[PDB]
Design a protein around this ligand. Structure first.
Ligand SMILES: [Hg+2]
Ligand SMILES: [Hg+2]
Ligand SMILES: [Hg+2]
Ligand SMILES: [Hg+2]
Ligand SMILES: [Hg+2]
Ligand SMILES: [Hg+2]
Ligand SMILES: [Hg+2]
Ligand SMILES: [Hg+2]
Lengths: 452, 227, 452
């Protein structure tokens, strides 16, 4: 019936043990990890292909490593931009400061959290929203819109002026824990004061300032505030590929446009969320980092268009920031991302659940942001077969830091790319520049609202 | 008085509760049988606990079929249906239905007892597929329906099929006899024939009817029962 | 036909790939070692049993390690005897000198080889015998009769006076290589001189003495000749379990009888060679170490009697030297010796070839000598199920140096035990003390003539 019957399971066992495939399966599966045991080398032999006919001219030098932090999104976003500096300044190796953005992102989220608590002060402490706000207020992960929020207010700077030196940039767990413990204390203090008074109250205003101050005080103990303010000048001496020395005096905000070539007004993030109609705008309620910054909004598009937008973008010599479900169907040793790389059907394990339902049923979401730097169209008259992916896990992960993702993987376990609005078809670009477009608003706890 | 021998290791699993609950009981066997080292089978309970939670989940989905897929409860049920962790009452639930057995007859040999992440992931991925399938069938039919009943049995079967690939069902059924040969501290050999359920009372000295768990939750008044 | 047809093998492939068990098998077998992949934990769960109702009272202390040498036979033979000293002198730990015997064994084999070449000087250099003599003249392995040959001429000594200090005792490969290279030079020189002269010739006699001398000269460079001669007195101070100091003055030859309790006249080696009739004596032609020592002769007996002789011997509190085919069906990590421990039938691999044919067809022979220190008779009214085995590979091999061997393994992959003649049934003992018994003579290259 609905309960586990002991006779029933022992009878099923008896039946399974009579099948030779099951006998072999239990023997091997009790010995090794399923992924290790089932890795299919016949398939690997064909899929581990590193020839890409369409690639970004500039090489990702050097391979970056986020270490023990969830700063992939910042690495990937800056990895896309570093290529412009590398190229425009004829540099052998170059990196924009990921830590720079990380410092400001964490400060802003702690501050942003306080406001979120204030705006939901009318809800019970045990409500879904309040408990959600309290879950991970300072997590490292983020979205592209959140990336632009920071670049708009703070600009970009070369890693040479501010790098991953502090312990907390490469091992952020403890720092976040200390901060979050305080914020949860502040959350209580704010709400309590909000029972008697209004937010506009002089007392509340004073209270929030003292919280902001302690938040900055604590963050400055683990990382130094960047050396220059956004509009403040910095001098950067460097050597080009020709062993020639140069000096650049700029400001974080000027450097971002002038050298990094970012016009914050052009990138838009396209998502592939099968639970909603395409051509529709999807907005994640409350998701953000900079209080007052822009909101996360995606244009929902089909995989056919998405695939093309990626090829065109690559052909226009630009890398493509994308978000997917790591490490689903990802072999870190080889760097292969193929949903058929492991022989699960040999053990009769099959998964018919569709993408939309996978998202709906708590099974798949975006968890990591990486960079597409190449692709390979079937050399004849067909379409893209695989893509070249640059990860931020050091040069030993995958094949010298690089991965290869199948088209099928792209369709199934990848949910987002970032393009410039001018690359979109008029029909799509308009959804961003029109007004009729009322976005489908999803809660903060929706799987597409789960950062990277 | 009795010493915890040997020190146990749950490895990469959240089976602490089973280790701790059995660590409390092992002391009785160790003592009553004059043994230098002794361990009750944690894996025994682990196998049944995981099977039962997968099954239990299905029922939870059926009983909340009227709620939206994105409701707080349904999303919660879908979060970690087979997690290793548990409570003491859940520990007794298992001992009542399955009894206890010496680790010598069924130990941490399988890869999945000491590295359960993958196993749980494979199971949970299936259960989330089943969750959808059940709810869909529940839109048109009632749970008492012959069709639904059949559906749940085929899910239960696949769940057991998949679990048996990573761990073997214990060697004896709860009321089935087993023979256990051992050596006491005096280098003397002994043989015990018992059943998992008898061994639990007789040797492990557990009367499931006596333990109660006291909690210290300052948000609620004391002397009050919390469920 | 008799040749490999390409169409045929691709057609068979096509057929095998349609079977689900084959698909899973190729997937896993391309990833792991067959023994690792097929190790059956369901079976291991039952077979890894360390309860033995019949065990030798004294404990093997400490666990020995032959390291990189084939001195198992000496370790096992002395491991059987150490128990007497340990017991009779109330010692916590004790070891007889394995190196002592090793030095003399190697010296004697080099010398013995020379004689073998002289006695086969009439045969062509490329004959089977001469090429065999030239293959491994100084190999570390040996037989029990060869063990007694040494004890009779040299006695036994405590390891405290002469141990495994030299590099060559634990890494004998190079030493053997240097010696063997010289001996092969000597072999040529002898044969050449034997074409013109007779062995009794003064010149030949002189020649062999100069070879013997160079052989000793070279061996003394890698190991020191033992400190005392066989009839020479030595003084050994030791501490018993009671922290009490003692001193023993003895001679290597006296110590062997007096303390080690060995009467070289009692042990006989029983073999289980299914290719020959039981009750028959089997002699290995030319096999030896000490020129003039005894010859290797085995009494061929059935497994039923053999099993009993082992139980009785164990009950008489004595350990049993045995020889088998290591590492066939041996799991070094657990220490389990079980021919059904790996699930080969799950991949359809089955071996019907019988023991006698296995020996005949170059598949099974004795390769390692170990020690049975216990057994477990089915506690009811049946027979032995398993045996407790002491190996000489250190305390980390198996379970703290110890192994457990099934009865079935004993019957199939074990070919010899050593008992005292007085333990045999009159019918069997007589074969040794009669005269009618003309032994079945096997060549030196016969698999039973392959040492340990
Ligand atoms: Hg991340
Ligand atoms: Hg392409
Ligand atoms: Hg492409
Ligand atoms: Hg995508
Ligand atoms: Hg050997
Ligand atoms: Hg026995
Ligand atoms: Hg026995
Ligand atoms: Hg044998």
């Amino acid at each position: 019936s609905s309960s586990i019957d002991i006779s029933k399971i022992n009878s099923w066992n008896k039946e399974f043990q009579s099948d030779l495939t099951h006998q072999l399966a239990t023997t091997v599966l009790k010995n090794y990890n399923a992924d290790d045991a089932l890795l299919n080398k016949t398939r690997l032999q064909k899929q581990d292909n590193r020839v890409f006919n369409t690639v970004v001219s500039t090489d990702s030098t050097p391979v970056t490593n986020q270490k023990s932090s969830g700063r992939c999104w910042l690495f990937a976003a800056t990895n896309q931009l570093r290529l412009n500096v590398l190229s425009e300044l004829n540099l052998k190796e170059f990196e924009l400061s990921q830590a720079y953005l990380f410092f400001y992102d964490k400060l802003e989220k702690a501050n942003y959290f306080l406001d979120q608590i204030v705006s939901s002060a009318d809800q019970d402490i045990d409500s879904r929203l309040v408990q959600y706000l309290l879950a991970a207020p300072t997590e490292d992960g983020g979205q592209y819109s959140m990336f632009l929020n920071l670049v708009k207010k703070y600009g970009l700077i070369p890693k040479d002026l501010y790098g991953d030196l502090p312990y907390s940039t490469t091992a952020s767990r403890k720092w976040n824990s200390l901060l979050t413990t305080k914020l949860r204390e502040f959350a209580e203090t704010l709400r309590t004061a909000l029972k008697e008074r209004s937010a506009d109250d002089s007392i509340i205003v004073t209270l929030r300032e003292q919280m902001q101050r302690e938040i900055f005080r604590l963050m400055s103990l683990f990382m130094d505030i960047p050396p220059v303010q956004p509009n403040e000048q910095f001098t950067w001496e460097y050597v080009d590929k020709d062993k020639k020395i140069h000096t650049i005096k700029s400001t974080p905000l000027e450097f971002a446009s002038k050298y990094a070539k970012l016009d914050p007004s052009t990138p838009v993030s396209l998502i592939n969320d099968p639970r909603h109609p395409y051509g529709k705008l999807i907005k994640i309620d409350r998701l953000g980092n900079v209080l007052g910054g822009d909101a996360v909004i995606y244009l929902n598009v089909d995989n056919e268009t998405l695939s093309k937008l990626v090829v065109k973008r690559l052909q226009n010599n630009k890398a493509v920031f994308f978000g997917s479900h790591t490490p689903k169907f990802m072999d870190k040793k080889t760097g292969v991302m193929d949903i058929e790389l492991w022989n699960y059907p040999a053990i009769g394990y099959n998964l018919p659940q569709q993408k939309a339902s996978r998202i709906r049923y708590h099974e798949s979401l975006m968890t990591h942001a990486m960079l597409i730097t190449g692709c390979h169209v079937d050399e004849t008259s067909k379409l893209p077969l695989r893509y070249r992916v640059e990860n931020s896990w050091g040069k030993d992960s995958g094949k010298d830091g690089l991965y290869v993702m199948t088209q099928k993987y792209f369709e199934e376990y990848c949910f987002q790319i970032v393009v410039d609005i001018n690359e979109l078809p008029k029909e799509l670009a308009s959804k961003f520049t029109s007004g009729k477009e009322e976005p489908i608003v999803l809660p903060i706890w929706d799987p597409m609202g789960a950062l990277a």
